[PDB]
Amino acid sequence: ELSRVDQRHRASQLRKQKKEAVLAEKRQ
Amino acid sequence: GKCRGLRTARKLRSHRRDQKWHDKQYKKAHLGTALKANPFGGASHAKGIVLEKVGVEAKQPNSAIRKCVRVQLIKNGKKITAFVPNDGCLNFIEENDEVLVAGFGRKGHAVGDIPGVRFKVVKVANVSLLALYKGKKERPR
Amino acid sequence: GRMHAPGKGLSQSALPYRRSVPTWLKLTSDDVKEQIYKLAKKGLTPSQIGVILRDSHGVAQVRFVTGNKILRILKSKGLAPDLPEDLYHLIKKAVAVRKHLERNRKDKDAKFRLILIESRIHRLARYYKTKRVLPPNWKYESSTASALV
Amino acid sequence: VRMNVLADALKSINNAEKRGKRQVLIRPCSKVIVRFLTVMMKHGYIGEFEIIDDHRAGKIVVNLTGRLNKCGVISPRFDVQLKDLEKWQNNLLPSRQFGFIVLTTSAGIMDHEEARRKHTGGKILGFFF
RNA sequence: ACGGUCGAACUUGACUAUCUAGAGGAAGUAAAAGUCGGGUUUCCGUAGGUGAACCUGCGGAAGGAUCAUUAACGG
RNA sequence: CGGGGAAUCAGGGUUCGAUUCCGGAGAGGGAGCCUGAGAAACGGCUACCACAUCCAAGGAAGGCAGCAGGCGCGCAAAUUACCCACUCCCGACCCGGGGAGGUAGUGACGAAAAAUAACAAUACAGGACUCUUUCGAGGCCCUGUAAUUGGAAUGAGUCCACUUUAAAUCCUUUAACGAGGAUCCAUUGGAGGGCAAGUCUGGUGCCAGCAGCCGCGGUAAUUCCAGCUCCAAUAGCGUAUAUUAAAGUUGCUGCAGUUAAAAAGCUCGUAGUUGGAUCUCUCUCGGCCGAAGCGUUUACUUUGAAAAAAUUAGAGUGUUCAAAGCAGGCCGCCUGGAUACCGCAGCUAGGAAUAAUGGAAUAGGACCGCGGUUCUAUUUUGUUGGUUUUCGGAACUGAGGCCAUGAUUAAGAGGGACGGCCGGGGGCAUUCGUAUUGCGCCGCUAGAGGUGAAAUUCUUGGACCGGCGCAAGACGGACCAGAGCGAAAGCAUUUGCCAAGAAUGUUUUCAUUAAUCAAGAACGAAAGUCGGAGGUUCGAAGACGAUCAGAUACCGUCGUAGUUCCGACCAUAAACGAUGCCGACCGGCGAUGCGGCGGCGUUAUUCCCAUGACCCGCCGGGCAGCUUCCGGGAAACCAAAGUCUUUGGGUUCCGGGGGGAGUAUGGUUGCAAAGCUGAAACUUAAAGGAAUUGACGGAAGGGCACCACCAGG
């Protein structure tokens, strides 16, 4: 994967997508 | 032979680390390419969703069909095959079920007759397969 | 064994235990020293002077008779050459091999032996620079080497 | 080339003792070799020797008594402190009753027992038993 | 309010790196009993012969199973 | 995040340390501030970026990586409890406050203690002491089966009370109740081997399954599924994973590199590492001593003082024992709360072996006195203005005396000389030899070639054959050997020229100048690639002819690149001794090559003297050989592959189960081909090395037989 800051960016992107899915499911 | 001078410390330690990289277990532990190819990601256990049930054919001298399961792990999305040990224990598993999986015992190496299985099912629907097999508990769905 | 050859030979001198001047040798230290002075004025390296003194005049060792070795006597009076004898001979040999390689281009063995001679020249030059016999700015160069001899 | 003349002398003594010989010629000689043989002689291990005094580095002919099993050098000459002499005598010596680490200290070349008596440390030279 | 300073951040192109939908192509797999059907002892390196293998050329190895003869030579 | 430290460990080591103590950093991310002694502070402010709350739509308010708690995340982690009583902290303060901290709740993380029953009598059963030839006879203990009995002791629990505490709970102390096996009932794994404990019975039948590994299961399963029994640990025991020891399978201690994985094709060479002997305390100031310089400086070694506590080790001490703790003990007293270790670096004072380093060789070298030039003395010229007070101190200098004046010796280390040789070592020119091919002429003939047979092909325009010549390119046979030379690749016709080189000989010279070498650099068979020349033979490709159920490799004829030379590239081989280099030691023998030495003799037709060829020895370096129970080794074997658990001479490269794979990618070199460097996913229980027997030979020899044949009935 390399490039520590880019690995952290990937982790932040996955966090954002999973949290968006969670909030979409819970509000219904 | 070896250098044995009183000033040969850095030669000795540099040659030691360079030839340390030629050790297979050391290179597995420290290069970091096996840890990212490992589906568990440095975890003792993982939890996944049953995709399908598989009959895996046993290797050449033994004739049996081992009941395994194709599971997709929740935390990374990778697909693994896990063996369901005891007899009739595949019947406790349904499709799209929540399953706790561990390794099978040889640290990522396939074991025994089963070709290409490194994992075994430990828990099904958050109850253990041992308690289901011995009939101590009941399974929800 | 050898520096640049596979040989391991034993050809060398063996001085006797006896350091005293033999009783038949009726030569004082001053006569031997003036003989060394006139042989150097004729023009000879200390190896040649020692060989002439040993063969003809019966002087077994100069430093057993005079107490001092030949090159130190020459340096003390002042007839020592500026470059040492062995370095001079090595540079002369290198010049001859360079002349041969200029004449003959396809001679690979001459190139190899020239490389060995240059390695020996550089080793001697480093040793003489450590002992302050040569100046520290001295260097052997490919083009201007025959001028030194 | 020839490095560590003590190693050559001790190896020659060991090889000719293992062969059953009575005398050993070792060349060259040195003060360290003579001191080592003097220490090894005072414990009744080797016998008595002559230094052939040529005008070069001398030679030594040493008589052999059949009391020697192994005489050996340690290269390099490691620094040994008194706190660390016990580990060295555990590593090199066959028993606590016999065997000798020879070491050079500022009080001279001696054994490990005399080094303990005089409370000194130094650099290791050898061992014999 | 002009000016200076520290400076978050914003816009435009390049170098990128990551996340995330995709018409299509090339595949393989499970389902069709459907249709048609002699040579080599063992090698090495290079080159050619359709890629590899294999064969041949050139140069190398044995990591391949030595029987028999050998005293005269002077006039 | 770093340390203190932790796990493991013979010794050396490996791994962990987010985590309560010390230090740092930060409060969603960056940035800028105010106040203040102290902040670039976030339970302060102001922005932007990202989130997100209330809206009446104008506006307003945010920051749990504090304590609880929630969502999310996950294999993975507790109550929205009580108190400021203890420990301390803040304030104007004996008084107030503290989700710091304390106390309970959850808690099989982990550690310490410790139940699940003991005994007596009988019935069998053993093993002992006494008496008996023995059998046996007893009073001596022990053991369980007790489908046998018997009362005694109890903690679990139930639960008054006291004690504990801020209030409680718990623990402790105690009334009362609380024990006969259908109970107050102990589990988790296993029973083929490793590895302790069943060839038990029933079921299944290569299925289901078990099995870390080897394996079990296809109808007598010691291995599956059960019953019984047995085994291990036991309030605990499995399984997955990280790690440590096993692992002398990372080897410093302490591994390997002939044949098992492995030494570079070869040499040079810088950094690095290593490097032969040798050399046995005092002058001035102050009270025999203290101050001043030391002494070339170190490395080393010993000592001293600095190295937080906790933790580790360890002293004392009956927490009922222990893990713990720092307390306690004696009738107001007596006390403890030690000590050790704490790398390396930095101080400090002794020792001077070992290992570096230095002091005098154009002598502007030490020790003394004899003088000059220049700059200076801070006091003695009572008070002075002074040209001068004197004295004494620093640097540049000229001779003199004095020192036993001053250079370890010359490595069975090295370099360089000089000597007579020696060799297929190299380069250039030159000379010769045959063979082959082509051509010309002459002679006679119908075949010649090729194959296991043929065929293709040449051929009476006259092939093949024999003779006389000419030319072209190639190659240097036999001599030619376990001979020689070279760093290796390699090197063989004559002569000449050119520079090299080993060895030997030397009472020559220099005097450590050396060994092994990352980086770097020359050379490097064959094949191959660029330019030119030339192409005799041979010849990859290619074209034909044969050969067969299916032949497309073999075989024969022709033949292109090439094979040859010159100049550029390439850097690869079973580039081999499948064996790094330098140095030392440990058995023997005689052949050979070169050099040297000592010789009685034969020969150059007896040679007039040396010199060449032989003959006998000796020495040095070589190519090799034989022999040996030197020692090693898994062995075959090896005088090295020996001097290795009795393990350390110096140093370079280099291997770590078999494959993927010397592959992908990247870099670099090359015109190209490719060379150098060089993985991973994945797969596998083996692959390999040495030896040892010989089913079976489509291997070979013999013998026997009308249940074999031959001649027959």
Swiss-Prot record, chain A:
Stretches with biased composition (Basic and acidic residues): 1-9
Subcellular location: Nucleus, Nucleolus
Domain of life of the native organism: Eukaryota
Family listed: Belongs to the TRAFAC class translation factor GTPase superfamily. Bms1-like GTPase family. TSR1 subfamily.
Role description: Required during maturation of the 40S ribosomal subunit in the nucleolus.
Protein name, UniProt field: Pre-rRNA-processing protein TSR1 homolog
Organism: Homo sapiens (Human)
Shown part of the complete sequence: 47 to 74 of 804
Curated annotation (Swiss-Prot), chain B:
Biological role: Component of the ribosome, a large ribonucleoprotein complex responsible for the synthesis of proteins in the cell. The small ribosomal subunit (SSU) binds messenger RNAs (mRNAs) and translates the encoded message by selecting cognate aminoacyl-transfer RNA (tRNA) molecules. The large subunit (LSU) contains the ribosomal catalytic site termed the peptidyl transferase center (PTC), which catalyzes the formation of peptide bonds, thereby polymerizing the amino acids delivered by tRNAs into a polypeptide chain.
Annotated Basic residues bias: 1-19
Assembly with partners or alone: Component of the 40S small ribosomal subunit. Part of the small subunit (SSU) processome, composed of more than 70 proteins and the RNA chaperone small nucleolar RNA (snoRNA) U3.
Major location category of this protein: cytoplasm
Source species: Homo sapiens (Human)
Pathological condition linked to this protein in its record: Brachycephaly, trichomegaly, and developmental delay: An autosomal dominant developmental disorder characterized by brachycephaly, ciliary trichomegaly, dysmorphic features of the face and hands, hearing loss, and developmental delay with short stature. Intellectual disability and autism spectrum disorder may be present in some patients.
Keyword Ribonucleoprotein set for record: yes
Gene Ontology MF terms: RNA binding; structural constituent of ribosome
Modification 3-hydroxyproline occurs at: P61
Record protein name field: Small ribosomal subunit protein uS12
Subcellular location: Cytoplasm, Cytosol; Cytoplasm; Rough endoplasmic reticulum; Nucleus, Nucleolus
Crosslinked positions (Glycyl lysine isopeptide (Lys-Gly) (interchain with G-Cter in SUMO2)): K36
N6-acetyllysine, modified sites: K134
Region ranges (Disordered): 1-25
Highest rank taxon of the organism: Eukaryota
Curated annotation (Swiss-Prot), chain C:
Keywords assigned by UniProt, alphabetized: Acetylation, Cytoplasm, Isopeptide bond, Nucleus, Phosphoprotein, Ribonucleoprotein, Ribosomal protein, Ubl conjugation
Assigned GO CC terms: cytoplasm; cytosol; cytosolic ribosome; cytosolic small ribosomal subunit; extracellular exosome; focal adhesion; membrane; nucleolus
Claim: Acetylation is one of the keywords in the record: yes
Gene3D superfamilies: 4.10.860.130, S15/NS1, RNA-binding
InterPro entries found in the cross-reference section: Ribosomal_uS15, Ribosomal_uS15_arc_euk, Ribosomal_uS15_N, uS15_NS1_RNA-bd_sf
N6-acetyllysine: residues bearing it: K26
Crosslink position(s): Glycyl lysine isopeptide (Lys-Gly) (interchain with G-Cter in SUMO2): K42
Annotated positions of the Phosphoserine modification: S29
Phosphotyrosine: modified positions: Y37
UniProt modification remark: Ubiquitinated at Lys-26 by RNF14 and RNF25 in response to ribosome collisions (ribosome stalling).
Signal peptide per UniProt: none
UniProt GO molecular function: mRNA 5'-UTR binding; mRNA binding; RNA binding; small ribosomal subunit rRNA binding; structural constituent of ribosome
Chief location: cytoplasm
Cell compartment(s), UniProt: Cytoplasm; Nucleus, Nucleolus
Disulfide bonds: none
UniProt KW RNA-binding keyword: no
GO BP, sorted A to Z: cytoplasmic translation; negative regulation of RNA splicing; ribosomal small subunit biogenesis; translation
Cross-link (Glycyl lysine isopeptide (Lys-Gly) (interchain with G-Cter in ubiquitin)): K26
Matches recorded under NCBIfam families: PRK08561.1 (NF006331)
Family classification: Belongs to the universal ribosomal protein uS15 family.
Quaternary structure, from the entry: Component of the small ribosomal subunit. Part of the small subunit (SSU) processome, composed of more than 70 proteins and the RNA chaperone small nucleolar RNA (snoRNA) U3.
Protein name per its UniProtKB record: Small ribosomal subunit protein uS15
Organism field: Homo sapiens
Lineage of the organism: Eukaryota, Metazoa, Chordata, Craniata, Vertebrata
From Swiss-Prot, chain D:
The entry's keywords: Cytoplasm, Diamond-Blackfan anemia, Nucleus, Ribonucleoprotein, Ribosomal protein
Role this protein plays: Component of the small ribosomal subunit. Part of the small subunit (SSU) processome, first precursor of the small eukaryotic ribosomal subunit. During the assembly of the SSU processome in the nucleolus, many ribosome biogenesis factors, an RNA chaperone and ribosomal proteins associate with the nascent pre-rRNA and work in concert to generate RNA folding, modifications, rearrangements and cleavage as well as targeted degradation of pre-ribosomal RNA by the RNA exosome. Required for proper erythropoiesis.
NCBIfam families: PRK04034.1
Official protein name in the record: Small ribosomal subunit protein uS8
Primary residence: cytoplasm
Lineage, top ranks: Eukaryota, Metazoa, Chordata, Craniata, Vertebrata
GO molecular function, one term: RNA binding
Subunit comment: Component of the 40S ribosomal subunit. Part of the small subunit (SSU) processome, composed of more than 70 proteins and the RNA chaperone small nucleolar RNA (snoRNA) U3.
GO CC annotation, single: small-subunit processome
Organism: Homo sapiens
Keyword Cell division carried by entry: no
Protein family membership: Belongs to the universal ribosomal protein uS8 family.
Gene: RPS15A
